[PDB]
Amino acid sequence: GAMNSSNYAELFNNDIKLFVDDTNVYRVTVHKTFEGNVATKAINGCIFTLNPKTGHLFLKIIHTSVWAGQKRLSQLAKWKTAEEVSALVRSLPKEEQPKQIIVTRKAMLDPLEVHMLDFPNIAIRPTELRLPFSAAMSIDKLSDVVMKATEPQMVLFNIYDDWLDRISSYTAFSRLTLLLRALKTNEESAKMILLSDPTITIKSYHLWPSFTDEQWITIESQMRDLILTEYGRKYNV
Amino acid sequence: MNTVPFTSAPIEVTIGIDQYSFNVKENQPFHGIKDIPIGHVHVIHFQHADNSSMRYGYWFDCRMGNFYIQYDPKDGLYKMMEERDGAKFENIVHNFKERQMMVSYPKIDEDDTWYNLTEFVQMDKIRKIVRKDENQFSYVDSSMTTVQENELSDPAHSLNYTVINFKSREAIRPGHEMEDFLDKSYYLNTVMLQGIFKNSSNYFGELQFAFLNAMFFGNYGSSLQWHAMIELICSSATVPKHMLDKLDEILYYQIKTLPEQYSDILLNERVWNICLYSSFQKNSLHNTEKIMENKYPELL
Ligand SMILES: NCc1ccnc(N2CCOCC2)c1
Structure with missing residues (x-):
């Protein structure tokens, strides 16, 4: 079920799990047009997928070209996040694949569930915690790699350094x-x-x-x- | 016109025939139901005076044999049976009619309600959903679970409805996960219609039978199946125009016939509000939307 204060230490047991946060996948600046209308311009984005036990961060950079010609980008973003988490799991050895994926926003449940319907033994869970992972783009080195990317790209980090x-x-x-x-x-x-x-x-x-x-x-x-x-x-x- | 005689009525019971019903008292001299329209399936159903628990009943078609009801005091229910001796049967029915011991199927000449609720229901398909090959009629009751419910325990007494699951392998094509989940046309049209049901008439038949079992027996898994088959159509952007038109007539007559007092438990707020107001087909169900808004505006 949902992850909350009551089952918090489960994050640090020896069952592999990943948080997935999609806040920063679809990012825009809103501006005025010459005609005085309003328009958005997308900027690069990222999927924040984190093992809370090891600190391993799989930062999937979302290059603005992925939105070109697409409609309903907020909805698409969720499905794109799900598609990318799904190939990440498929590329990882079976013994590294997560037993649970915890999404920080409930709108990711249905997208992640369809993408992983052929993975029935990975539990997709929401959480009641209001975790601050959207602030990941305030870490200068992560912001830097996202903004400089010129193509889709996966970068691996340990967000705990050597702690x-x-x-x-x-x-x-x-x-x-x-x-x-x-x-x-x-x-x-x-x-x-x-x-x-x-x-x-x-x-x-x-x-x-x-x-x-x-x-x-x-x-x-x-x-x-x-x-x-x-x-x-x-x-x- | 056809006849279902009763050997006797030893316990007090409310008897249903199709959308009609009447009360018979303990040991009242009642010997059955006459003037039943040939050409349609029918259901005869029962609710004992003592135990309103377990509504139960029988689906039958009079063209498929001579059927009668007899109380069994061991199993404690009204049981449908076939009489194979046709002369014995006609002799029995003729004597009971002469003594006027039967109630008449009370159809109004103007009234197409039953036809409209059973237009696509076929006895052959009922017998594949309710598996009991040795009888030509089909027993259903309030408590029977569905195959899909049993996946989430006795397989013999199950309702083998066609399994519909929106987050599944049949439903979703590899690489079309977002497309097929948001627009279920491929699941509707290729998988279910072309692949499983073969045509929309068989689809609509199961959808009508599920409704009727939810309405007459309060059968929860049948209600689940009815809303699911509605939802699959409403959630598909591409649906043959003749099917939308027929679906609107189907649902209209189901909503019209539902007891006003059972709407709270037989109608799924989410499915109905989605179908009428959010789905691809939110503008294709004019008759159904009109009767729902006038009869059950609370649910919406
Ligand atoms: N992305 C989930 C998904 C969706 C649809 N079909 C899938 N299959 C069918 C082919 O063999 C197993 C994988 C997987």
Whole structure:
């Protein structure tokens, strides 16, 4: 059934699973035409498919050419996401294929279900959690690879960097969702927080800075402060 | 005109014949139903006075044999049986009519309702849905489950309706996952019509029989099958024009005949609102949409 606070630690057991988020698949800018009408221009996009246990991120870049000549792009986006998750599973060895796929939005259930009808032993699940994966495009290196792509392309990342060397996957997912929640509520502050100290760098093969354990606790606290605050600045409290 | 005699009426029972019904009291001198129109299937059905649980009944065609009802006190129901001795049968029926111990099938001359609800229903196809080859009539009751329900337990007592599943291999072509799910024309026209039913008349026959079993027995899996066969047509962008026209007449007479008080449980809000207002065929069912809006505007 649905994934919620009550069955949260299931994400970190030894059953392979993937989150699929489609928020950033179909992305547009809205602008005025010379005639004063409004028009959209699509920009590149991405499917965010994440193993929460390992940190393995399969970032499927969605190049604007996939929309050319198509109608009803919001609906098509969901089916395209489903088509791409489906070939990802088909290309992976049987022992790596997920036993569950959890979608962050319920409108992905029916698309993913038809695409995987010949995979009856993979459970497709929704969730009641309001996970902040849309903020994935606020991670500079992921935004960069999406925007520079000139053709469809799959890029593999570990979104936990090397954290699993020192913390458990439960703690690594909690850190990740805190960072993404922060970047989603106030991207500028969040980024200032992460990059304030010039001496802490991001390794070429990482996405985030090389914080010590002590520094991560400071950072995490600073991100909590931000989230409560903006929640004040928002509801005035 | 044909006749279904009854040996007797030992227990108090509400008897249905087609869309008509009448009450018979315990040991009342009742010996059956006469003047039944030849040329149509019929259903004779029962609801005991003590146990409104289990409505049950028999589908039959009078052209296929001489049939009668006899109460069985061991199994506790009114049982349909065939009489093979035609002289014994005619002699029995003639005596009961002479003594005027039979109720007359009460058809109004103007009234095409039964014809319209059973236009495409054939006894041969009923017997393939309700498998009991040794009898020429078919027993159905409220509790019988469908083959597809049994996939989600006794196969002998099942309703072998044609399985329709919108998120399936027959339904969906490899590489046409979005096309075939949003526009079910290929599932309707090639798989079901051309492949399984052969023609729209057999399709409409099963769709009418499912309705009738949902209405007369409150059979839940038959209701599921009726709404599914409607939904498959409404969800198909490409449907022969003659089929849309006939479907509108079919549904119109079903909606007209439904008891107003049973609409809450026999009509699926989602399917009906989708078919009449969202689907490809939202503008092709004028008679059905008109009677639904005037009779059941709450559901919509
Ligand atoms: N993409 C799911 C899907 C949809 C339709 N047919 C599929 N088959 C039929 C061919 O052999 C097995 C795979 C698979």
